[PDB]
Design a protein around this motif. Structure first.
Motif, PDB file in Angstrom:
ATOM      1  N   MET A 169      -2.932  -6.768   6.391  1.00  0.00           N
ATOM      2  CA  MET A 169      -3.155  -5.380   6.760  1.00  0.00           C
ATOM      3  C   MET A 169      -1.990  -4.868   7.597  1.00  0.00           C
ATOM      4  SD  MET A 169      -6.363  -3.931   8.920  1.00  0.00           S
ATOM      5  CE  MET A 169      -7.395  -4.752   7.710  1.00  0.00           C
ATOM      6  N   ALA A 170      -1.394  -3.768   7.161  1.00  0.00           N
ATOM      7  CA  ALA A 170      -0.305  -3.145   7.894  1.00  0.00           C
ATOM      8  C   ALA A 170      -0.849  -2.072   8.832  1.00  0.00           C
ATOM      9  CB  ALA A 170       0.700  -2.518   6.927  1.00  0.00           C
ATOM     10  N   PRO A 178      -7.519   5.844  12.497  1.00  0.00           N
ATOM     11  CA  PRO A 178      -7.037   4.829  11.549  1.00  0.00           C
ATOM     12  C   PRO A 178      -6.613   3.546  12.252  1.00  0.00           C
ATOM     13  CG  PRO A 178      -6.080   6.980  11.077  1.00  0.00           C
ATOM     14  CD  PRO A 178      -6.748   7.096  12.409  1.00  0.00           C
ATOM     15  N   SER A 179      -6.962   2.416  11.639  1.00  0.00           N
ATOM     16  CA  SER A 179      -6.701   1.093  12.195  1.00  0.00           C
ATOM     17  C   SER A 179      -5.696   0.284  11.395  1.00  0.00           C
ATOM     18  CB  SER A 179      -8.012   0.300  12.287  1.00  0.00           C
ATOM     19  OG  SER A 179      -7.770  -1.054  12.620  1.00  0.00           O
ATOM     20  N   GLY A 180      -5.734   0.378  10.072  1.00  0.00           N
ATOM     21  CA  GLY A 180      -4.858  -0.416   9.233  1.00  0.00           C
ATOM     22  C   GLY A 180      -4.919   0.074   7.805  1.00  0.00           C
ATOM     23  N   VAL A 181      -3.943  -0.368   7.013  1.00  0.00           N
ATOM     24  CA  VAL A 181      -3.848   0.018   5.611  1.00  0.00           C
ATOM     25  C   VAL A 181      -3.578  -1.224   4.774  1.00  0.00           C
ATOM     26  CG1 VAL A 181      -1.388   0.598   5.724  1.00  0.00           C
ATOM     27  CG2 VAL A 181      -2.841   1.654   3.965  1.00  0.00           C
ATOM     28  N   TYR A 182      -4.268  -1.337   3.641  1.00  0.00           N
ATOM     29  CA  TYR A 182      -4.070  -2.477   2.760  1.00  0.00           C
ATOM     30  C   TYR A 182      -4.387  -2.072   1.328  1.00  0.00           C
ATOM     31  CZ  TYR A 182      -9.113  -2.907   3.561  1.00  0.00           C
ATOM     32  OH  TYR A 182     -10.467  -2.664   3.682  1.00  0.00           O
ATOM     33  N   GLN A 183      -3.940  -2.904   0.387  1.00  0.00           N
ATOM     34  CA  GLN A 183      -4.202  -2.694  -1.032  1.00  0.00           C
ATOM     35  C   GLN A 183      -5.478  -3.400  -1.447  1.00  0.00           C
ATOM     36  OE1 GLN A 183      -2.556  -0.087  -2.296  1.00  0.00           O
ATOM     37  NE2 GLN A 183      -2.349  -1.191  -4.232  1.00  0.00           N
ATOM     38  N   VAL A 239       4.094   0.445   2.181  1.00  0.00           N
ATOM     39  CA  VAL A 239       3.960  -0.223   3.469  1.00  0.00           C
ATOM     40  C   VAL A 239       3.320  -1.587   3.254  1.00  0.00           C
ATOM     41  CG1 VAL A 239       1.733   0.843   4.022  1.00  0.00           C
ATOM     42  CG2 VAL A 239       3.219   0.024   5.876  1.00  0.00           C
ATOM     43  N   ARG A 276      -7.490  -8.942  15.912  1.00  0.00           N
ATOM     44  CA  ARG A 276      -7.544  -7.509  15.651  1.00  0.00           C
ATOM     45  C   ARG A 276      -8.397  -7.198  14.428  1.00  0.00           C
ATOM     46  NH1 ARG A 276      -3.126  -5.299  11.897  1.00  0.00           N
ATOM     47  NH2 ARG A 276      -3.657  -3.082  11.637  1.00  0.00           N
ATOM     48  N   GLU A 290       6.603   7.524   9.109  1.00  0.00           N
ATOM     49  CA  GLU A 290       6.995   8.406   8.013  1.00  0.00           C
ATOM     50  C   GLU A 290       7.668   9.672   8.528  1.00  0.00           C
ATOM     51  OE1 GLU A 290       3.702   9.033   5.110  1.00  0.00           O
ATOM     52  OE2 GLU A 290       2.838   7.239   6.037  1.00  0.00           O
ATOM     53  N   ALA A 315       0.832  -1.191   0.000  1.00  0.00           N
ATOM     54  CA  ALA A 315       0.000   0.000   0.000  1.00  0.00           C
ATOM     55  C   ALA A 315       0.873   1.250   0.000  1.00  0.00           C
ATOM     56  CB  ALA A 315      -0.914   0.013   1.225  1.00  0.00           C
ATOM     57  N   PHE A 316       0.256   2.384  -0.323  1.00  0.00           N
ATOM     58  CA  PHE A 316       0.988   3.637  -0.220  1.00  0.00           C
ATOM     59  C   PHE A 316       1.106   4.047   1.249  1.00  0.00           C
ATOM     60  CE2 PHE A 316      -0.338   4.091  -4.676  1.00  0.00           C
ATOM     61  CZ  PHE A 316       0.848   4.520  -5.230  1.00  0.00           C
ATOM     62  N   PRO A 317       2.172   4.763   1.613  1.00  0.00           N
ATOM     63  CA  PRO A 317       2.284   5.265   2.989  1.00  0.00           C
ATOM     64  C   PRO A 317       1.067   6.119   3.310  1.00  0.00           C
ATOM     65  CG  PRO A 317       4.342   5.585   1.784  1.00  0.00           C
ATOM     66  CD  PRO A 317       3.302   5.189   0.771  1.00  0.00           C
ATOM     67  N   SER A 318       0.468   5.874   4.471  1.00  0.00           N
ATOM     68  CA  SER A 318      -0.861   6.401   4.764  1.00  0.00           C
ATOM     69  C   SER A 318      -0.860   7.708   5.544  1.00  0.00           C
ATOM     70  CB  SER A 318      -1.706   5.349   5.491  1.00  0.00           C
ATOM     71  OG  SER A 318      -1.091   4.952   6.705  1.00  0.00           O
ATOM     72  N   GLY A 319       0.308   8.224   5.921  1.00  0.00           N
ATOM     73  CA  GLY A 319       0.350   9.387   6.797  1.00  0.00           C
ATOM     74  C   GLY A 319      -0.445  10.577   6.289  1.00  0.00           C
ATOM     75  N   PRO A 350      -1.106   1.766  10.187  1.00  0.00           N
ATOM     76  CA  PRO A 350      -0.961   3.077   9.543  1.00  0.00           C
ATOM     77  C   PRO A 350       0.449   3.595   9.776  1.00  0.00           C
ATOM     78  CG  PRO A 350      -2.989   2.969  10.834  1.00  0.00           C
ATOM     79  CD  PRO A 350      -2.178   1.755  11.197  1.00  0.00           C
ATOM     80  N   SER A 351       1.082   4.075   8.710  1.00  0.00           N
ATOM     81  CA  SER A 351       2.520   4.320   8.729  1.00  0.00           C
ATOM     82  C   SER A 351       2.908   5.756   9.057  1.00  0.00           C
ATOM     83  CB  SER A 351       3.155   3.888   7.403  1.00  0.00           C
ATOM     84  OG  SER A 351       2.584   4.590   6.312  1.00  0.00           O
ATOM     85  N   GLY A 352       1.939   6.649   9.248  1.00  0.00           N
ATOM     86  CA  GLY A 352       2.262   8.060   9.412  1.00  0.00           C
ATOM     87  C   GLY A 352       3.265   8.345  10.516  1.00  0.00           C
ATOM     88  N   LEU A 383      -7.331   3.007   3.854  1.00  0.00           N
ATOM     89  CA  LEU A 383      -7.040   3.257   5.265  1.00  0.00           C
ATOM     90  C   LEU A 383      -8.310   2.935   6.042  1.00  0.00           C
ATOM     91  CD1 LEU A 383      -4.947   4.209   7.366  1.00  0.00           C
ATOM     92  CD2 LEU A 383      -5.882   6.531   7.069  1.00  0.00           C
ATOM     93  N   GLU A 439      -4.002   9.850   7.070  1.00  0.00           N
ATOM     94  CA  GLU A 439      -4.275   9.804   8.504  1.00  0.00           C
ATOM     95  C   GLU A 439      -4.572  11.190   9.060  1.00  0.00           C
ATOM     96  OE1 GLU A 439      -1.224   7.467  10.716  1.00  0.00           O
ATOM     97  OE2 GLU A 439      -0.729   6.654   8.737  1.00  0.00           O
TER      98      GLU A 439
END
Lengths: 306, 306
Positions: free
Chosen positions: B6-7, A122-127, B125, B298, B14, A7-11, B9-11, A115, A14
Motif C-alpha cells: 500500500m502506497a 485517505p490512508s493508502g492506495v493499492y491495486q 504510484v 499502520r 502530484e 495504482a493510479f495517482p489518487s489525488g 495517497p499521492s495527491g 483509496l 482524494e
C-alpha cells in the motif's frame, strides 16, 4: 524495467472524500458536484444491521440527521434519497475539486485502484482485481466503509467500486456507484460467504508476457497447444477457460514479444504441471493473475529487451 | 483484514510535479515554494552523459535555457544553481499547492511510495523499499527521471528519493533531495552495477507478524532460538543480522500477537531450512522483505484475529 502492482495517482479521488455521520455511525462518502454518495448502512445502528428495512429506517430520517464534513468544513444536506444500496445526499455546495468522472461497473478479472479511507481521510492506495467470485482481496479495517475503487483515463475518473463489508474469509464485498452489489451479497448481517473462486487465465498469460518484455524467458518451451487442449488443463487446475477474444486481446503483447498466444499457453500448461522448481517470475513464486493485458501494456516498455 | 503493498495517497505530490526541458532533454521536476528540483542530467546531451563535467556544462547555460512547465502554465526561471546531483531552478511563482514538506534521507531496509511521472504528468504510484545495496526495485521507463519517492506523516510529505537511472540488472538508482546518491553510483555513463544484496530480516519478521495478526499461524512452532543462533542461520541464507534494536522495534507486534521475537525467529529459521511445502503466507510463496514494522502496524488491525 521493473514490474510493480501500480495504482493510479489518487489525488483526483482524494479531493472527493468526505465523512458522513448519522447518529453514532460514521463512514466515508464521495462528494461529486453537489451530491455525496455513501453506503446506506450509515443509517443503521448495529442492532439494525441484522435485519434492517432500509426504506423504513430512511423515512424516519430528515436532512438534518445527516452530518457531512469535508476536511474542516461542514456541508449542509438539503436532500436525500436512496438508490439501491447507496445514499445520495444533496448538499448546498458543489465540490470545486470534482474531476471529470463516470460511474462504470467492471467485470470480474478487471483491475482497479482502491483509496482506503477512514473518517473521510485517505490512508493508502493499492491495486485490486475483481475476483471471478465478485469479491476483492482488499486491505480494509473498521471505518473503511465507503472507500472507493477507480481507474483513470485521460484525467477522467471512472469510479467502479464502493466498499461495504468484509466476508468471513477476510475478503471484501461492495457495490458499483449505483449501489448494486458485485456478486450475491447484501448489506445486512447474514452468514453470507464468498463462493468458490478461480484463477484469471488471461491475466496470468499477460503477466507471463510482461516477464518476457522485461527480458526473462526461462519458462518458455518449444511446444504449442490448441485452445481446446489448453482449456482441458485449465479446468483441472481451477483456471478460467480462455476464449478467442482473450487471444485477440493478447495480440499486441504477442506481436511485441514474437511469442504466439498458443505458444505461451503451452508454457503456462508446463508451469502448472511442473511448478517453478525454486525459480521466480517477476519477483514472484506464484502465477500472478491480478494484472490485465492493459495493465501490462501500460506499465511495460514498448520495446522488448531482446 | 487483508494485506497489500500500500502506497501513501499521492495527491500532495502530484500537485508538485512539473516538466523541465533544457535543449532537447526533458525530464520531471519537483516544484516546492519558488524552487524546482530536478536531476542535473537535464543539461546533458546523450553525447555528454559518457564523460560530463557538470560545472563546465552548467556555466555555459543561462536562466532562459531552462523551460519549466506546470500543466499548461510555463514558469519563468529567474535563477539556477547546482547542489550535488540536483539542479535548483528558482522560478518567479511559488507553488500554491506546496504541502508541508521535509527532505529526509532514508536507510536501507526502509520503504517509501514512488510517484512515477513522465513529462511532468504522474502515471502511477507504488511502494518500494531501499535495498541493502542502495538500489530500488522500481518500475520506470525512459522519461521517468526526476520522479520522486516519499512518505507522508500528518499531512507532511517527507521526500526521500529522486530517480536518476537504471542499472544493467534492471534495478534503479537515485539520490536524496539534496542530490546525494544512494549507494556507489554516479550520474554518468559507466559500467557501474548493483553490488551484492541481502534480505531485510527485520522486515521478514514483521511480515510474519502481519500474517499472524490476520489470523494465520501455520508456520509457527514450539521452538525458540538465541539471537546468536538465529544470526548463524541468517548468514548462511544471505539474510542481514538481527540486532537487539530490531527486537525492540518488533516489541509492539510481539505483544499484540503474544509471540516472542525469538520465537518468531525460530519460525523463520524453519521456513528457511524447509521452504513452504506448497503453502503460502499472505498470498505469497516467498518470504517478503519490503514491509517494515511500521508498515505492518499502520495497515493491520490493532486487534489480532485470535
Amino acid at each position: 524495467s521493473g514490474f510493480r502492482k501500480m495504482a493510479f495517482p489518487s489525488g483526483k479521488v482524494e479531493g472527493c472524500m468526505v465523512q458522513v455521520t448519522c447518529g453514532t455511525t460514521t463512514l466515508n462518502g464521495l462528494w461529486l458536484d453537489d451530491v455525496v454518495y455513501c453506503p446506506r448502512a450509515v443509517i443503521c445502528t448495529s442492532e439494525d444491521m441484522l435485519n434492517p428495512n432500509y426504506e423504513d429506517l430512511l423515512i424516519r430520517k430528515s436532512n438534518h440527521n445527516f452530518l457531512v464534513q469535508a476536511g474542516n468544513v461542514q456541508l449542509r444536506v438539503i436532500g436525500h434519497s436512496m438508490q439501491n444500496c447507496v445514499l445520495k445526499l444533496k448538499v448546498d455546495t458543489a465540490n470545486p475539486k470534482t474531476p471529470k468522472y463516470k460511474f462504470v461497473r467492471i467485470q470480474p478479472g478487471q483491475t482497479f485502484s482502491v483509496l482506503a479511507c477512514y473518517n473521510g481521510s485517505p490512508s493508502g492506495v493499492y491495486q485490486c482485481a475483481m475476483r471471478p467470485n465478485f469479491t476483492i482481496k482488499g486491505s480494509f479495517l473498521n471505518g473503511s466503509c465507503g472507500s472507493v475503487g477507480f481507474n483513470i483515463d485521460y484525467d477522467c475518473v471512472s469510479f467502479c467500486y464502493m466498499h461495504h463489508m468484509e466476508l468471513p474469509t477476510g475478503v471484501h464485498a461492495g457495490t458499483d456507484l449505483e449501489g448494486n452489489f458485485y456478486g450475491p451479497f447484501v448489506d445486512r448481517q447474514t452468514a453470507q460467504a464468498a463462493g468458490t473462486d478461480t484463477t484469471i487465465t488471461v491475466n496470468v498469460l499477460a503477466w507471463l508476457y510482461a516477464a518476457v518484455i522485461n527480458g526473462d524467458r526461462w519458462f518458455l518451451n518449444r511446444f504449442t497447444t490448441t485452445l481446446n487442449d489448453f482449456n482441458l488443463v485449465a479446468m483441472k487446475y481451477n483456471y478460467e477457460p480462455l476464449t478467442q477474444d482473450h487471444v485477440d486481446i493478447l495480440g499486441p503483447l504477442s506481436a511485441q514479444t514474437g511469442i504466439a498466444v498458443l505458444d505461451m499457453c503451452a508454457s503456462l500448461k508446463e508451469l502448472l504441471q511442473n511448478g517453478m522448481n525454486g525459480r521466480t517470475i517477476l519477483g514472484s513464486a506464484l502465477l500472478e493473475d491480478e494484472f490485465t493485458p492493459f495493465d501490462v501494456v501500460r506499465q511495460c516498455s514498448g520495446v522488448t529487451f531482446q
